Design a protein around this ligand. Structure first.
Ligand code: ZN
Lengths: 316, 515, 140
RNA sequence: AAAUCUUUCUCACG
RNA sequence: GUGAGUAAAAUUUGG
């Protein structure tokens, strides 16, 4: 009397007939699988060269240059940031800055590869400031050696459009760096480069919550000697700097797409592989179509550069 | 840095990708892939193997777990405003409650019995009929799944109807039981590492190992394969209803409904799709879409490829590879002897998500790493100290604390930086018991839970019924008067003993303090 | 009229599991918005203030772990640790004392935990969580 | 303006 | 701040 799983209902036949009348799949072609040795150094070199040719490079490192001191004290940094915000005609309300927009071009922003600064000693301060600002946007936030400013981006509608941000309002993060690029700004004898980044709340929360120090320390436990590199990520023994690797790590924290994780997984497969499918395992290193933006593109390019350098200096 | 590790490193030390992109493009791409496969020009979606070796469970009594049918997780509930269909994203609890109210049933088991014991599809169960339930259960809603490491472009996941959830729960429970019966590695009580060791034991005899993955795994599992497997294990009419709902399923993209005849929409059924392959041979250790087999000669490789093709498990040419000295399964890498491969492996970092919860998660991660031999104990101590300093730097400001007690952690205004060994042995101030991996929940965890309980989708004006007597079963039926009486009696008892709220009970601490 | 009638419309009797599922507030999910939520309205600050003065002076002071034995690195294996549940009488006493009914009720179930370990001793004994490297033994 | 279909709610009461 | 309406209100986003 107890109902069992295999119970047959009165509508079983009708439902089976309905399923039979419905469309069915068609047999697919049988694939041909060829197994060959994993990719060599030349293949990674070709991938890097193709990326470099297609996208090129920037003149300056943009926000990635904010990992080094701007050479100004707290008061000067606050003055420079506030005057830059005023210069670009940011609305002022309740002691905070707001950026107003009316129309959008609906086209992607130009993307290239950011050259690596010499070092990123202020990575921890920058990540903490990014974490704090987005939840305290509007005013200038200061740390021991650097400062930033997060400006909410809200639409312009008229007299009364919007006075406070919502859970989905994006933020323009503005930071200071040493002068010497096209983004220089001068005021009252103070010169500094002002660099901006447009981040939605999820990206900001992801970036700010990373632990730079612990991540680096854990990586250092079982790590081989890191070779010096140049501004382009190429092995430069004569004039390279080993500190640039820290910068690379910082970039991995700034890129919310974390394509470096995909490259790392594929490299782990590569190191353990004795034979891989022909012409298909290599395609796993081409992730340019999976991402869009300057920061993710730079992250992917420098992850590929790291893979190439590992294959070059410590062949496996 | 991950590229210069002596051992194996998957780069898990940073959180997964995230963004606010709308899920329309991903869902549309998945639907297009499923349609292309149904056209039979890209991948095989026709099952050819024989499943005669799967035991028949048709005599098993129909049992439904009530607990898993209620959860704070999202789901789709379909209503009819003016003939048209409107899909509302609610919580599974509210969706199931609405379904029971509409069908006027006391529990899901009664609902399924009534559904299975109707004379016709047009017969009414409450205010609806089986035909209307089947029509409504074919609607799905789309969302984006984020934080998946190694997926820069996030994938699309789907929210289904409560009736679909009920039938899926029944069928998946039975399929999991059958899988456990088929082989020992599929036992319910088995961790990823233990299954990895079992895999190493299984595939030790032969020479080459095929570490393989499936491509478009969800789009290549048609409703026909699911029906075949369910008939093989004897699901009766429940399998037929599930297959009928899957074949006619629709997905709400933005504001338009799209038909998706092919596929199963991102892992709704894992045990069934695994049985699709495990029911045709025994030279495999599939775990849904991540299998591992072994071979000696190219002929055996050809047999393996033919077996994979015949069971709708399309091998992924971009990730699958062959090894001789390593063994990869469930993202875990072992040696052919079963030993864990040296290196970081799958060790993952702990993001900053609270002054105290971060320390608890770091302690759990370090305990896991040390117990498995990933790193020595002194390295764990150093890393714990460094994380404590970082937390103090992040959270030691007036926004989170105003205290200065000595025993407090350095991140809450105190001056205490305990060692890992001291914390693990419970040799500390009781305030630190919460930071132990096995201790009680931390303050911030409770605060976050309470705040979540007040969100728009979960807010309710009902009178909470908590602190129930351990004896009363959860299947006992209650009414408003019963709840009021129980709450009043418990409040009176608590007031009679000089307490306003119950004291939290911890198993580990209670057992330790016992005489 | 009553919220019970509105929620469970048409039904005058519902299971305790369904009733509780509408008021569950002990589930925690680690999400990106943790810091923002903790900062909102100084909720964490207030919770810490309340804990330090109302709940903290009730936790019992348990003893530390002392027993430990020599261990050496060995092949990775799985350690099965069995934790028994509360008996009916123990559950009744704990409830009548004034403990949270939900926790005591949940502790009734027997539990078994599988943990990978890469250390062993001569007598093949079970270790504590995260202390197998040092050798602290469960002694049960 | 930028990591470009995203930075987009309404109403009642205190 | 609360409550409600909206194929939707951030525990968002399922197996
Ligand atoms: Zn510049």
């Amino acid at each position: 009397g107890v109902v069992k799983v295999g119970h047959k209902a009165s509508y079983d036949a009708e439902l089976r007939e309905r399923l039979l009348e419905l469309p069915h799949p068609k047999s697919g072609p049988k694939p041909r699988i060829e197994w060959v040795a994993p990719p060599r150094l030349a293949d990674i070199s070709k991938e890097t060269a193709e990326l470099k040719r297609q996208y090129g490079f920037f003149e300056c490192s943009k926000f990635l240059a904010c990992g080094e001191e701007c050479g100004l004290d707290q008061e000067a940094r606050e003055l420079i940031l506030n005057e830059y915000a005023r210069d670009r005609e940011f609305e002022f309300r309740n002691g905070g800055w707001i950026q107003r927009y009316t129309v959008a071009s609906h086209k992607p922003a130009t993307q290239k590869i950011l050259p690596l600064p010499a070092s990123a000693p202020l990575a921890r301060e920058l990540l903490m400031l990014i974490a704090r600002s987005t939840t305290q946007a509007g005013k200038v936030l200061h740390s021991d050696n650097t400062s930033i400013l997060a400006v909410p981006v809200m639409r312009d509608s008229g007299k009364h459009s919007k006075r406070r941000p919502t859970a989905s309002t994006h933020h323009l993060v503005v930071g200071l760096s040493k002068p010497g690029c096209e983004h220089d700004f001068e005021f009252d004898g103070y010169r500094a480069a002002v660099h901006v980044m447009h981040l939605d709340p999820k990206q900001s929360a992801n970036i700010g919550e990373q632990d730079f120090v612990s991540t680096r320390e854990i990586y250092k436990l079982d790590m081989l000697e890191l070779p010096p590199i140049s501004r382009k990520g190429d092995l430069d023994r004569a004039s390279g700097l080993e500190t640039r690797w820290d910068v690379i790590l910082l970039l991995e924290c700034l890129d919310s797409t974390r394509v470096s994780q995909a490259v790392a997984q594929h490299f782990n497969r590569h190191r353990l592989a004795l034979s891989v499918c022909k012409d298909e395992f290599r395609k796993g290193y081409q992730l340019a179509s999976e991402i869009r933006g300057t920061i993710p593109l730079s992250s992917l390019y420098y992850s590929l550069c790291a893979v190439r350098l590992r294959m070059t200096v410590h062949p496996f | 840095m991950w590229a210069f590790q002596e051992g194996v490193c998957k780069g898990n030390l940073l959180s997964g990708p995230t963004s606010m992109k709308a899920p329309d493009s991903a869902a549309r791409e998945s639907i297009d892939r499923a349609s292309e496969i149904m056209t039979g020009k890209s991948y095989n979606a026709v099952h050819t193997g024989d499943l005669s070796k799967l035991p028949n469970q048709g005599e098993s009594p129909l049992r439904i777990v009530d607990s898993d049918l209620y959860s704070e997780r999202s789901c789709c509930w379909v209503i009819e405003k003016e003939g048209r269909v409107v899909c509302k994203s609610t919580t599974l609890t509210r969706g199931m409650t609405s379904l029971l109210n509409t069908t006027k049933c006391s529990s899901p088991s009664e609902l399924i019995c009534k559904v299975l014991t109707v004379e016709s599809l047009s017969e009414k169960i409450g205010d609806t009929s089986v035909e209307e339930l089947l029509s409504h259960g074919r609607y799905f809603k789309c969302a984006l799944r984020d934080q998946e490491r190694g997926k820069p472009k996030s994938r699309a996941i789907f929210l289904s109807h409560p009736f679909f959830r009920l039938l899926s729960s029944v069928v998946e429970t039975h399929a999991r039981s059958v899988l456990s019966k088929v082989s020992a590695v599929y036992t319910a009580t088995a961790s990823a590492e233990q299954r990895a060791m079992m895999a190493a034991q299984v595939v030790e005899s032969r020479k080459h190992v095929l570490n393989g993955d499936c491509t478009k795994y969800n789009e290549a599992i048609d409703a026909d394969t699911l029906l075949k497997v369910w008939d093989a294990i004897g699901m009766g009419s429940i399998g037929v209803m599930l297959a009928y709902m899957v074949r006619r399923k629709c997905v709400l993209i933005k504001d338009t409904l799209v038909e998706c005849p092919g596929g199963m929409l991102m892992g709704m059924f894992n045990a069934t799709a695994t049985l699709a392959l495990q029911g045709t041979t025994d030279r495999f250790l599939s775990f849904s879409d991540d299998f591992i087999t072994s071979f000696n000669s190219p002929a055996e490789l050809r047999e393996i490829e033919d077996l994979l093709f015949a069971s709708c498990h399309n091998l992924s040419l971009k990730k699958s590879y062959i090894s001789v000295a390593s063994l990869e399964i469930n993202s875990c890498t072992l040696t052919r002897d079963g030993d864990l491969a040296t290196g970081l492996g799958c060790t993952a970092g702990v993001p900053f998500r609270g002054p105290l919860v971060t320390l608890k998660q770091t302690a759990a991660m370090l305990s896991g790493a040390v117990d498995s031999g990933v790193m020595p104990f002194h390295s764990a101590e150093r890393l714990f100290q460094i994380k404590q300093q970082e937390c103090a730097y992040r959270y030691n400001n007036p926004t989170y604390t105003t205290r200065n007690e000595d025993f407090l952690p350095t991140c809450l205004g105190g001056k205490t930086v305990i060692s890992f060994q001291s914390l693990l042995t419970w040799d500390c101030h009781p305030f630190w018991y919460q930071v132990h991996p096995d201790g009680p929940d931390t303050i911030d965890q409770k605060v976050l839970s309470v705040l979540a309980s007040k969100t728009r989708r979960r807010r309710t004006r009902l009178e909470a019924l908590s602190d129930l007597d351990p004896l009363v079963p959860h299947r006992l039926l209650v009414s408003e008067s019963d709840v009021s009486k129980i709450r009043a009696a418990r409040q009176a008892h608590l007031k009679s003993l000089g307490l306003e709220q119950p004291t939290n009970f911890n198993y580990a601490i209670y057992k330790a303090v016992q005489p | 009229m009553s919220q019970f009638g509105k929620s469970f419309k048409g039904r005058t009797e519902v299971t305790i599991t369904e009733y509780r599922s509408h008021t569950v507030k002990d589930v925690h999910r680690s999400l990106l918005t943790a810091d923002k939520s903790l900062r909102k309205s100084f909720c964490f600050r207030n919770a810490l203030n309340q804990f330090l003065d109302k709940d903290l002076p009730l936790l019992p002071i348990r003893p530390k772990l002392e027993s430990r034995v020599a261990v050496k690195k060995s092949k990775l294996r799985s350690q099965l640790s069995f934790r028994p549940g509360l008996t009916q009488e123990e559950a009744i006493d704990l409830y009548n004392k004034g403990y949270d009914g939900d926790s005591v009720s949940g502790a009734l179930q027997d539990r078994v935990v599988n943990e990978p370990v890469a250390y062993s001793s001569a007598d093949n004994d079970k270790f504590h969580r995260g202390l197998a490297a040092l050798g602290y033994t469960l002694a049960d």
